[PDB]
Write a protein that binds this ligand. Structure first.
Ligand SMILES: *CCC(=O)N1CCCc2c(C(=O)NC3(c4ccc(Cl)cc4)COC3)cccc21
Length: 334
């Protein structure tokens, strides 16, 4: 048994399907966002306690904790704006407008060294091949530095992740292409066709020899970071890992969520991966053509649509967030 389950608790303050829930860099605060544009900042250790609440007038699409200033939260809107929110003072410090009408701020990533962040800003969704941009921001001035050219065409970037030092940024796009940016030369080092359909999440492996991706074709793929488009391993996930995520009644009425928040998360050493399913988090060991499901966290009566996995004080915390607005917090020890 890789993990002992110490407890499962429920955070139930959201009354709408969850878009995002991320643990802060200190491993002690959650920021969660639902489809009604309600932001909650909450603690869970030693008890569940709401620290900040606010309903956005404008639609909110993305959420990223600052890396050196634990209390600062970046919020991306659907109206071409990035907000810097102080969770301690419970006030907006900054709102900045993105030029052109690429109003959809789909992705935010803070550099590990705290000096910069990137955001993707996309046109409104009409086809899968809507134009998008990738912007680099300086945290010290909160001013835009540059925009990365995207080849062969401007395209919506769905997901972004920095490596440990912050010299590489991996991206997944609506055209199914993964682009790896050198953040010192500010250029595309590497790009390849990763998925048939949209890329939903990307991450560096612990050892950073590979990047992991999940996409609309239902595939979980591990890529060789030294050889463009060369697969290390590849699995067909069950369909409820990638959606679309559906909550029905007997009304004829249903809610449908295509992935927006992170579809996978990893333990501190990247040996294990948390994924969505209809009834809760499913954890796999990373290493059999059929992938090795070793722990099911359960506890959900509606589809899980986004996950996180945080480790602090030698104790792991799994977030599983479902379309009923419920967030299950499962405590795992090695
Ligand atoms: C948007 C312009 C503005 O009104 N302010 C006032 C307070 C915030 C701010 C900063 C700033 O806090 N810069 C940090 C920082 C910003 C964003 C993140 Cl994600 C992390 C760190 C640099 O250490 C604080 C700078 C300039 C102007 C504004």
């Amino acid at each position: 048994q890789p993990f002992i389950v110490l407890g499962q608790e429920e955070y139930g303050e959201h009354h709408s399907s969850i878009m995002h829930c991320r643990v802060d860099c200190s491993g002690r605060r959650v920021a969660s966002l639902d489809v009604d544009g309600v932001i909650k900042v909450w603690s869970f250790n030693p008890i569940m306690q709401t620290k900040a609440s606010s309903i956005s007038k404008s639609p909110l699409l993305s959420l990223e904790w600052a890396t050196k200033r634990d209390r600062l939260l970046l919020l991306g809107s659907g109206v071409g704006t990035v907000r810097l929110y102080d969770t301690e003072a419970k006030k907006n410090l900054c709102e900045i407008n993105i030029n052109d009408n690429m109003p959809r701020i789909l992705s935010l990533a803070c550099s590990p060294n705290g000096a910069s962040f990137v955001c993707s800003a996309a046109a409104p969704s009409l086809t899968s091949q809507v134009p998008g941009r990738l912007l680099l921001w300086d945290t010290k001035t909160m001013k835009q530095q540059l925009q990365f050219s995207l080849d062969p065409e401007p395209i919506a970037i769905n997901c972004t992740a920095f490596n440990h030092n912050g010299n590489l940024l991996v991206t997944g796009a609506a055209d199914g292409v993964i682009r790896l940016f050198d953040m010192q030369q500010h250029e595309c080092a590497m790009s390849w066709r990763a998925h048939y359909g949209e890329v939903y999440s990307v991450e560096f492996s612990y050892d950073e020899n590979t990047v992991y991706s999940i996409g609309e074709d239902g595939k979980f793929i591990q890529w060789n970071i030294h050889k463009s488009g060369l697969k290390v391993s590849e699995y067909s996930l069950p369909s409820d890992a990638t959606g679309p995520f559906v909550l029905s009644g007997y009304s004829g009425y249903k809610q449908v969520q295509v992935p927006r928040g992170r579809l996978f998360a990893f333990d501190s050493e990247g040996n294990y991966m948390l994924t969505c399913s209809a009834t809760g988090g499913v954890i796999y060991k990373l290493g059999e053509k059929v992938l090795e499901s070793c722990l099911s966290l359960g506890g959900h009566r509606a589809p899980v649509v986004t996950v996180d996995w945080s480790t602090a004080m030698d104790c792991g915390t799994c977030l599983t967030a479902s379309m009923d607005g419920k967030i299950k917090l499962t405590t795992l020890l090695a």
